[PDB]
Amino acid sequence: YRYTGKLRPHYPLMPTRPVPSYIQRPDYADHPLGMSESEQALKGTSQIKLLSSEDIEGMRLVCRLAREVLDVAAGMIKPGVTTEEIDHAVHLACIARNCYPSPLNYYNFPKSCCTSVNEVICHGIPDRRPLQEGDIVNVDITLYRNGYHGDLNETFFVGEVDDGARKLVQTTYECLMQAIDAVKPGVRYRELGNIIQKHAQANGFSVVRSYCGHGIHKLFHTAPNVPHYAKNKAVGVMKSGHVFTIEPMICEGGWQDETWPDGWTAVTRDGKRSAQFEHTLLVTDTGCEILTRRLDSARPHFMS
Template identity: 70%
Template structure:
């Protein structure tokens, strides 16, 4: 199943004259990241099949006309328990609340406070290892955009800046571990994680969501 999803995304990207940004990026072997349940991010597609009750994140990035775009979303497979649905909804809401803040003059460190407050209000935590990032002709670049409160990110949002916000919301604790494949990040306590992401271009009075 995962292998098939990767093949579909690869073909759809190439057919549109683009290139899948993850493929061969620091030796990442596939065209999409697929992260299920306790996998926080950077899951490598394999022969595994989805099952009823899973939550699955598809992180799709492409390079087109000299620029990268990056977005992801988490989906419920069949009937998911109430806590799982709440986790997915909270992750989406965290992103929406952060996007609503984006305008010139905001500090990059300020997004994390709003995200973490909403996550904690719903009984969840925010992963601190992985952050949003600048994106343009480079796949990952400055600025660093943490998703947790009291972070030390530097910089002020200005017109023309392009970056992602992509909070990873955890059902249990925020800590993570990396599998021996050097890519797959999972929650240390084995509990689930959900994530949503958009690429944002800062305008004179707000932002444009480039990955809608």
């Protein structure tokens, strides 16, 4: 395999981390290939769940706990710390909140969160590589509690970063916030990509096409599929009680992605940097509730 940039996987991984049996598990946790039968049963359907009162409270809880875990990860971002170390802390933090780390064994994904450095777009596998000053790194967290998944991610600076990294990260966050600002009953899902691409393009950046936002609730990924790029053909209209993510991945160079031999790590084909931010959203009568909002600060970690 010809790698697209400087990053390489750093093996072996530590033995898979166990989740105590008292923590409730999603269907795929114990499937040999990590397949989710509940998800497969709805594969290719475009109908969107309207959450019940009980569902909304369940989503509120797991989304709050997921934010807590992302904040744990944020505190560990420094030169020399390996992404494996971040994942261990994350794994323990999920357990401490009586949650299952949703990525663990999801379609055999080996770790409990995704750590995406520099040219990795998404789905980076936590490994023995120490973070380097100048790096940017996304940590993507999803927790499962009482039948519900909650999903967020932020990109972080490792020590001092160059002006381009600052611009990419700032712009990506601005893309996310502009899209969220447009969310309310009656807006088409396909509209969000128009807003996101307009802003990214205005700042000399491109928009990943192969990976999208998604419905989430009792399933990790379900309808709607939410592309982040302009003139896309996403199906559906926002309604009060819909829950979904917006998680735009934006790139310094071209939009094209490819996957490492590990079957997971998505990287820019040109080896230039990519950044991502993600929230889980609940559509309300007036707009939307950001379920994964940071509670003790108005701003994401990179600003702070």
